[PDB]
Amino acid sequence: VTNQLQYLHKVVMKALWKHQFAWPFRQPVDAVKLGLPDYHKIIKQPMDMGTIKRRLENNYYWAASECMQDFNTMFTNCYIYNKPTDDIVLMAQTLEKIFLQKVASMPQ
Amino acid sequence: TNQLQYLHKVVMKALWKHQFAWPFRQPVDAVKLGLPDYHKIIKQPMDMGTIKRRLENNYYWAASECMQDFNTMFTNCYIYNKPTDDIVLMAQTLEKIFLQKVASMPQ
Ligand SMILES: Cn1c(=O)c2[nH]cnc2n(C)c1=O
Ligand SMILES: Cn1c(=O)c2[nH]cnc2n(C)c1=O
Ligand SMILES: Cn1c(=O)c2[nH]cnc2n(C)c1=O
């Protein structure tokens, strides 16, 4: 458990997971339930904050770069898949700015 | 700032010289590039040239202001372009380097 991963769990995940915009990212996209049949045709590496939260919990990551990449993949999937006007894009944009801000003060 | 000098001289140099960085070294010219819808979809254009000038003339107050400009540039690319466009892959490749370099910023 590196200091950075610790920071990513205690500071970054703590901040993002409890956020009023977090709820659509707390679990993988359910393409059936959300009625997005082309989702897994366009997004080939799905990611979400539940997966990351669990991986930070089970010390799945060897580096912070890895956990950072997963956050980035989750936000990037949303910007790529969704129409520019979808509310979820601006929800992801809001979360991703918190993530960046926090990451600006991560150790090492 | 020590962090802004790291963004200038470690992160931005790595990104600037990358073989995929050429579309991002200067603002999108919607006219020359044939994209008249570009500014109706992208309301905050951003590019590494602007970020570079801004680091040179001391525009930024904090690292995170500059990291937010990098992100806006990448996010603009994902939002405007179709998922199949090569520029999407180019941006992600550049974005991962940025995330990797930022992890090692002086705290
Ligand atoms: C958990 N959650 C919320 O917190 C929320 N707020 C508004 N819609 C919401 N939906 C659809 C939801 O699932
Ligand atoms: C991440 N994500 C999306 O990318 C998306 N697109 C449409 N609904 C969506 N929902 C609810 C979602 O969670
Ligand atoms: C950033 N950017 C784009 O987002 C884009 N979309 C299509 N060509 C593009 N070019 C040349 C570009 O520089």
Q: What is the Cα Rg of chain B in Å?
A: 14
Resolution (A): 2.5
Give me the amino acid identity at A75: F
The span from the CA of A81 to the CA of A65, in Å, is 24
In the block, tokens 């990351």 appear at A52
Nearest to A50 by CA among A69, A67, A27: A27
CATH of the domain at A75: 1.20.920.10
Give me ligand 3 centre to Cα B42, in Å: 11
DSSP string, B26-95: S---TTTTT-TTHHHH-SS---HHHHHHHHHTT--SSHHHHHHHHHHHHHHHHHHS-TT-HHHHHHHHHH
Q: Do A96 and B83 touch (CB under 8 A)?
A: no
The maximal CA–CA distance of chain B, rounded, in angstroms, is 42
Method by which this entry was solved: X-ray
Considering only CA atoms, which of A41, A1, A74, A2 is closest in space to residue B78? A74
For atom 4 of ligand 3, which residue has the closest CA?
A: B77
Structural domain of A18 = 3-104
A79 annotated among ligand-binding-site residues: no
User: Are A22 and A12 spatial neighbours (Cβ–Cβ below 8 Å)?
Assistant: no
Query: How distant, in Å, are the alpha carbons of A12, A23, A53, A89, B11 from that of A19?
Result: 11, 8, 14, 15, 30
Other beta carbons within 10 Å of A11 = 14
Q: Residues near B3 by Cβ (< 8 Å), separated by ≥ 6?
A: A104, B62, B63, B105, B106
Q: Which two tokens stand for residue A97?
A: 């700015």
Q: Which residues contact A79 (CB under 8 A, 6 or more apart)?
A: A89, A92, A93, B75, B78, B79
B25 class by beta-carbon count within 10 Å (0-12 exposed, 13-18 middle, 19+ buried): middle
- Matching residue, tokens 């570009």: B38
Structure-token match 């490749």, residue found: B93
A44 annotated to bind ligand: no
Q: What are phi and psi of A4, to 5 degrees?
A: -70, -50
Q: Residue A19: what residue type?
A: H
CB A108 within 8 A of CB A3: yes
Tell me how many domains chain A contains. Answer: 1
- Given B62, B75, B105, which is nearest A79 (Cβ)? B75
Return the closest-CA partner of residue B42 out of A74, A89, A36. Answer: A89
